[PDB]
Amino acid sequence: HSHGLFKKLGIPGPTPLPFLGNILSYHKGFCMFDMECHKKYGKVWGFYDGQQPVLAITDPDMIKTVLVKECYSVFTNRRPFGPVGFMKSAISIAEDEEWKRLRSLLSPTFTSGKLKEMVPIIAQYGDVLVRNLRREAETGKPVTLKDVFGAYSMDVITSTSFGVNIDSLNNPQDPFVENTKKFLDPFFLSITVFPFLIPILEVLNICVFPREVTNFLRKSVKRMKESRLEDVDFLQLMIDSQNKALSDLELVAQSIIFIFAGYETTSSVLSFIMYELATHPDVQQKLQEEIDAVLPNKAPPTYDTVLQMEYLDMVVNETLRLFPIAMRLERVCKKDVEINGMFIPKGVVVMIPSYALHRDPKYWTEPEKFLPERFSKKNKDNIDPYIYTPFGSGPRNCIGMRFALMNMKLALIRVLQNFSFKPCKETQIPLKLSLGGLLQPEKPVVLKVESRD
């Protein structure tokens, strides 16, 4: 019974129930619980996910010590989340020196050099997206953005990770699209209250990643890794490092994590962005004019062109402030240490509430408002990089940050070049967030899509 740890350390927080801890407070949701605790407890507080002690920190210097300074020494890993199977070799799931071998093996794939090589392949589906949009624009019926963006996010993934070129919106039957289309609480709740059952689920071959999908994928790599190019994508870039090096099953696990990390992240954020532009027409028009100025006469976007649109980058950053889809950052304290004046005992999970810090008035003026001008080159300097942490920070931040930014902007440039977006009767205004544990709209975003000539 570790429930006295925080009152023994003199750390405030909600009183834990036996076995359950504080998990019943998640009824309002992950983020609201972080916001309430931040308001009534202060800069540091603790709570129990079952019997697991979780210390929340909000001091920008302390966050830097955890995420950057003492990353390799103490705060190296995340906490386990369930029976993982062979996916223990995924970089996002690996720990300690095993992870350090993968982060080093996989860093050159996300170079700005390899990123520019992927733009033409993913720009091909920016045209595929706009084409699937012209039909629903003449259809005259509102559009569920998560379906078109999800198809686009899928079409970019398969081409960038395997070269497989599909119109997943128009080819919902390709065996490569069904499996890839495959959170919630009815399981992962019990995992946190019963983490002593994770070792049981492992020996039963029960995995959080379905056995239906993974078998198709390790064997669909089995054909296309060798027997296909045995005569620029994420797969080809990792193979070149095999020839301390990556294994076969290791390489499969890393590619599976890229699809998971790319599909319902790109499309979720892109759906959030279009909701903001439709409900803020001043911003959508101002962006459409910057898009038209840099790219005159519906010109195609390039690598260097995207990194030039400042208002586009300002719209992306501010949407990520309101909606950091990761919600929290977490590190497991590997040993007794003392960071910036307080003692963290071994085993305690240190947590940075990204969603709560993104909406704290201590740093944000009118936090509920969508105001891209906070990221103007005048005011971007006044933003603490350890308060605004949409991609994390330190040696274990989001490795696909620059890919995600480029992929999302290339979709927005093409989409806003040809269309305008307006709210409908079905448009949830104000948008309500999911009550679960996924930073998604409560009800899917539906907007009117008008064609620009």
Q: Does position 226 bind its own copies by CB under 8 A?
A: no
Residue 3 C-beta: closest distance to ligand HEM, Å: 27
89, 92, 279, 319: which one contacts ligand HEM (CB under 6 A)?
92
Q: Does position 77 bind its own copies by CB under 8 A?
A: no
Do residues 334 and 353 lie in contact, with contact meaning Cβ atoms separated by under 8 Å? Answer: no
Token code pair at residue 323: 């909606």
Q: Does position 185 bind its own copies by CB under 8 A?
A: no
Between 20 and 326, whose beta carbon lies closer to ligand HEM?
A: 326
Stretch touching its own copies by CB under 8 A, among 38-46, 93-101, 398-406, 435-443: 93-101
65, 400, 416, 446: which one contacts ligand HEM (CB under 6 A)?
400
Residue 331 C-beta: closest distance to its own copies, Å: 18
Q: Which does 335 bind (CB under 5 to 8 A by kind): ligand HEM, its own copies, none?
A: its own copies
Q: Does position 203 bind its own copies by CB under 8 A?
A: yes
Q: Scanning residues 371 to 390, which ones bind ligand HEM (CB under 6 A)?
A: 390
60, 80, 163, 195: which one contacts its own copies (CB under 8 A)?
195
Stretch touching its own copies by CB under 8 A, among 94-102, 103-111, 128-136, 294-302: 94-102
265, 288, 427, 440: which one contacts ligand HEM (CB under 6 A)?
265
Residue 222 C-beta: closest distance to ligand HEM, Å: 22
Do residues 311 and 318 lie in contact, with contact meaning Cβ atoms separated by under 8 Å? Answer: no
Stretch touching ligand HEM by CB under 6 A, among 4-12, 259-267, 372-380, 429-437: 259-267
Q: Identity (one letter) of the amino acid at 230?
A: E
Q: Does position 51 bind its own copies by CB under 8 A?
A: yes
59, 117, 178, 202: which one contacts its own copies (CB under 8 A)?
202
Q: Does position 310 bind its own copies by CB under 8 A?
A: no
Q: Known binder of ligand: residue 37?
A: no
Q: Does position 335 bind its own copies by CB under 8 A?
A: yes
Cα–Cα distances (Å) from 344 to 45, 333, 422, in that order, read: 12, 7, 50
Stretch touching ligand HEM by CB under 6 A, among 38-46, 265-273, 274-282, 303-311: 265-273
46, 53, 142, 262: which one contacts ligand HEM (CB under 6 A)?
262
Stretch touching ligand HEM by CB under 6 A, among 123-131, 260-268, 358-366, 430-438: 260-268
Stretch touching its own copies by CB under 8 A, among 96-104, 209-217, 246-254, 267-275: 96-104
Residue 392 C-beta: closest distance to ligand HEM, Å: 2
The number of residues that bind its own copies (CB under 8 A) is 13
Residue 358 C-beta: closest distance to its own copies, Å: 36
Q: What is the 3-state secondary structure (H, E, C) of the chain?
A: CCCCHHHHCCCCCCCCECCCECHHHHHCCHHHHHHHHHHHHCCEEEEEECCEEEEEECCHHHHHHHHHHCCCCCEEECCCCCCCHHHHHCCCCCCHHHHHHHHHHHHHHHCHHHHHHHHHHHHHHHHHHHHHHHHHHHHCCCEEHHHHHHHHHHHHHHHHHHCCCCCCCCCCCCHHHHHHHCCCHHHHHHHHHCHHHHHHHHHCCCCCCCHHHHHHHHHHHHHHHCCCCCCCCHHHHHHHHHCCCCCHHHHHHHHHHHHHHHHHHHHHHHHHHHHHHHCCHHHHHHHHHHHHHHCCCCCCCCHHHHCCCHHHHHHHHHHHHHCCCCCCEEEEECCCEEECCEEECCCCEEEECHHHHHCCCCCCCCCCCCCHHHHCCCCHHHCCCCCCCCCCCCCCCCCCHHHHHHHHHHHHHHHHHHEEEEECCCCCCCCCECCCCCCCECCCCEEEEEECC
Distance CA 166, CA 277 (A): 29
Q: Which does 398 bind (CB under 5 to 8 A by kind): ligand HEM, its own copies, none?
A: ligand HEM
Distance CA 116, CA 120 (A): 8
364, 375, 403, 421: which one contacts ligand HEM (CB under 6 A)?
403
Residue 51 C-beta: closest distance to its own copies, Å: 8
What are the b/e assignments for 358-394, b being 16+ CB within 10 Å? bbbeeebeeeeebbbebbeeeeeeeeeebbbbbbbbb
Q: Does position 257 bind ligand HEM by CB under 6 A?
A: yes
Token code pair at residue 310: 């400042």
Binding-site entries: 398
Interacting residues with ligand HEM (CB under 6 A): 67, 91-92, 103, 257-258, 261-262, 265-266, 269, 325-326, 329, 390-393, 396-400, 403-404
Binding-site annotation, residues for heme = 398
Footprint of its own copies (CB under 8 A): 51, 96-98, 195-197, 199-200, 202-203, 335, 346
